[PDB]
Amino acid sequence: MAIYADNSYSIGNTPLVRLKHFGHNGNVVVKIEGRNPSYSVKCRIGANMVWQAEKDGTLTKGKEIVEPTSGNTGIALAYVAAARGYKITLTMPETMSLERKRLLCGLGVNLVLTEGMKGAIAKAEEIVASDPSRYVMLKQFENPANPQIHRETTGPEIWKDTDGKVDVVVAGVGTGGSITGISRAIKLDFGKQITSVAVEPVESPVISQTLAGEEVKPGPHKIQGIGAGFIPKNLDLSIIDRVETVDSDTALATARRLMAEEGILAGISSGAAVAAADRLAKLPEFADKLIVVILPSAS
Amino acid sequence: MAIYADNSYSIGNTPLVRLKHFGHNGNVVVKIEGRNPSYSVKCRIGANMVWQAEKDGTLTKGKEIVEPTSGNTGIALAYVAAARGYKITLTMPETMSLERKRLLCGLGVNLVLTEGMKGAIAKAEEIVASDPSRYVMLKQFENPANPQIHRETTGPEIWKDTDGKVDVVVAGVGTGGSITGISRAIKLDFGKQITSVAVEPVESPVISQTLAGEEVKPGPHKIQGIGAGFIPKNLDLSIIDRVETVDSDTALATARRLMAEEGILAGISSGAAVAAADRLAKLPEFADKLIVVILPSAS
């Protein structure tokens, strides 16, 4: 019966856990996206972007994946390329975690060394163009199969596990696919007018500055996985009800609290997402509303 | 609806994935116990041992857990003590991973430094006896709630997800609870005469030497999580059909293969368990039999 044909098909069905030391009488529940292959939410889009390029015939036997590693998107693509027998080439800067090196190289990846993150993007492109018929780039910030997998899985899991009671969905934005696809699932396919809340670093609040017509001022920050410093094409502004900003220290402190007080290990961007939800959760406005927060990764 | 009241209740329902480059035409399927809170199988027993001591009244508000950290059992207990509001004290040797230190201390654990693993056991005991009314020791190698949680969850998940077709269950033995409880579920509660296969390091094959009446010769090895060098009280010899030995290098190489060829990240003890299953899987004897292998952890 329920035996997945490869590890890519095992993505998702991640759990909902109620928070005890956050929110107001249990109105904050978290979706633990770390209970995933490759230990992050990115497994969903790594699988679906590979899957869709197969349906497209833009990806076939003997074609080699190339992608600019967005830390976690590289691991997810790596494990999927290995699960489906594709050669893969990832590009990311000159250092990062030497654990991420050993892991990617352990996953059978061919890794490419560039000199920042806009810089790594380049050497992927000149590698793709080095031979356009051997190489496919998936482009995670604009590939519609990124939000589409969330509209098809992440959103519906939230709908089913909350029996339709979900009132607010809180999610940080890196590529924007999670909140776009979730919000699309619940508003458009299920028909409930929830409050979609994007979270971004207060140190780089380009979504807030954009929507307010203010000067867009990207800046350095420590909240890994969100705050790309621009509006991704996979972030559908038309569906964002509200934007919440969080600073790195609060985002970190919140991650520590989730561990010590809830027994939940999550990355700093989950701490940012929880801090934002807790803020909403303690407005009387949201006192009797079920808030669901995405925890995108483990650590 | 499906919202867990704390992280301890979210244990389990881990997935089955068919292996492509192991076994004979798909007869090896793996159970990814790393898709668990705390990223290992031990989450199941950390929860259930805490839960059962609560039912017992051997553990109540204000009592402080003490336990000799078996690497992964410490992390699982840590996250459960935090999820249920217990103070916890774990004992393990003088070094290990300074990441495990930061994680345990991050999980709110009070950590105790001893000078080997039989040595760490001692300072827990003299801490418990330092005040028997404040401290509870759970004793993972002999506590029946360890195999009992596998008879209640792990076994039945295997039964349901294979629609009863599971013929062989392959599992490494540290405390012995996984294979005991699984085998008890399938043989005794469901009534199928499967082949229960224990895996142990060839460098320390005390189960094989015992069952053969030979000299029991424990020895050093690198397969972390199994091979305690003795017969645990939670390992029910009466239910073991077969014992398979695996060396550290093969166990490691197999873990690498699972990553590079299957896209599955698992620890070295999962590599040992897969190597053993692959051996069985390529006996004509087992050619038309579904083999389920426990992958106990991520890394």
First to last CA, chain B: 33
Q: What are phi and psi of B100, to 5 degrees?
A: -60, -35
H helices present in chain A, as ranges = 42-56, 72-83, 98-106, 117-128, 145-149, 155-161, 177-183, 206-211, 248-262, 268-281
Chain centroid, CA A82 distance in Å: 21
Which two three-digit tokens encode residue B233? 């009280």
Burial class (CB in 10 A: 0-12, 13-18, 19+), B187: middle
Burial class (CB in 10 A: 0-12, 13-18, 19+), A117: middle
Q: What is the largest CA-CA distance in chain A?
A: 58
Decide which of A89, A120, A137 is a domain's last residue.
Answer: A137
A1 domain residue, yes or no: no
CB B210 within 8 A of CB B240: no
Block residue for tokens 């979504």 = A207
Residue type, A191: G
Count Cβ atoms below 10 Å from residue A285 Cβ, excluding itself. 10
SS3 B189: helix
The span from the CA of A67 to the CA of B21, in Å, is 26
A206 with A239, same domain: the answer is yes
| Method for this entry | X-ray
The span from the CA of A85 to the CA of B172, in Å, is 28
Q: What are phi and psi of A244, to 5 degrees?
A: -120, 135
CATH number at residue B219: 3.40.50.1100
The span from the CA of A122 to the CA of A115, in Å, is 10
Point out the annotated binding site of A.
7, 35, 72, 174-178, 265, 269
The span from the CA of B164 to the CA of B159, in Å, is 5
Which two three-digit tokens encode residue A219? 């800046």
CA neighbor of A16 nearest in space, from A151, A159, A148: A159
Count of domains for chain A: 2
- Full residue range of the structural domain in which residue B94 is found: 43-137
The span from the CA of B81 to the CA of A32, in Å, is 19
The span from the CA of B299 to the CA of A78, in Å, is 17
- The residue in chain A having the minimum alpha-carbon distance to the alpha carbon of residue B16 is A3
CA neighbor of B236 nearest in space, from B154, B150, B139, B147: B147
CB A139 within 8 A of CB A119: no
Question: How much of chain B is helix, strand and coil, in % rounded to 5?
Answer: 45, 20, 40
Resolution (angstroms) equals: 2.4
Block residue for tokens 């499967």 = B194
**Which residues does a gap of C–N over 2.5 Å follow in chain A?**
115
Decide which of A102, A120, A137 is a domain's last residue.
Answer: A137
Pseudo-torsion of CA A249, A254, A257, A262, nearest 10°? -160
CB A80 within 8 A of CB A50: yes
SS3 A59: coil
Does the beta carbon of A298 lie under 8 angstroms from any beta carbon of chain B? Answer: yes
A50 with A190, same domain: the answer is no
B218 with B133, same domain: the answer is no
B72 with B182, same domain: the answer is no
Count Cβ atoms below 10 Å from residue A111 Cβ, excluding itself. 17
Which two three-digit tokens encode residue B224? 């972390």
Pseudo-torsion of CA A262, A265, A270, A271, nearest 10°? 60
B21 with B50, same domain: the answer is no
**Which residues does a gap of C–N over 2.5 Å follow in chain B?**
115
A247 with A268, same domain: the answer is yes
B1 domain residue, yes or no: no
B155 with B80, same domain: the answer is no
Q: Which residues of A192-231 are buried (b: 16+ CB within 10 A; e: fewer)?
A: eebbbbbbbbbbbbbbbbeeeeeebeeeebebbbbbbbeb
The span from the CA of A247 to the CA of A230, in Å, is 17
Which two three-digit tokens encode residue B193? 């005469």
Cβ within 8 Å of B, A 48-107: 78-84, 103, 106-107
Chain centroid, CA A252 distance in Å: 18
CA neighbor of A216 nearest in space, from A226, A228, A206, A202: A206
Cβ-based contacts of A264 with chain B (< 8 Å): 7, 37, 79, 83
The span from the CA of A113 to the CA of A62, in Å, is 23
Long-range contacts of A256-261 (CB under 8 A, 24+ apart): A256/B106, A257/A21, A257/A22, A258/A19, A258/A295, A259/B79, A259/B82, A259/B106, A259/B107, A259/B108, A260/B82, A260/B106, A260/B107, A260/B108, A261/A20, A261/A21, A261/B82, A261/B108
Decide which of B86, B105, B137 is a domain's last residue.
Answer: B137
Give, to the nearest 10 degrees, the angle between helix A98-106 and helix A72-83. Answer: 10
The span from the CA of B175 to the CA of B48, in Å, is 15
Pseudo-torsion of CA A87, A92, A94, A96, nearest 10°? -110
CB A29 within 8 A of CB A16: yes
A252 with A189, same domain: the answer is yes
CB B273 within 8 A of CB B171: yes
B53 with B132, same domain: the answer is yes
Relative to beta strand A28-32, strand A16-18 is antiparallel
Out of B6, B16, B107, the one facing A260 most closely (by C-beta) is B107
Measured CA to CA in angstroms, residue B293 lies from A24, A106, B259 at distances of 43, 22, 16
Q: CA-based Rg of chain A, rounded to a whole angstrom?
A: 19
CB A223 within 8 A of CB A248: yes
First to last CA, chain A: 33
Which two three-digit tokens encode residue B134? 């404040």
Cβ-based contacts of A161 with chain B (< 8 Å): 1-3
Block residue for tokens 């059992």 = B73
Count Cβ atoms below 10 Å from residue B110 Cβ, excluding itself. 14
Whether B40 is catalytic: no
Beta bridge partners of A291: A28, A168
CA neighbor of A199 nearest in space, from A282, A280, A297, A283: A280
Cβ-based contacts of B4 with chain A (< 8 Å): 15-18
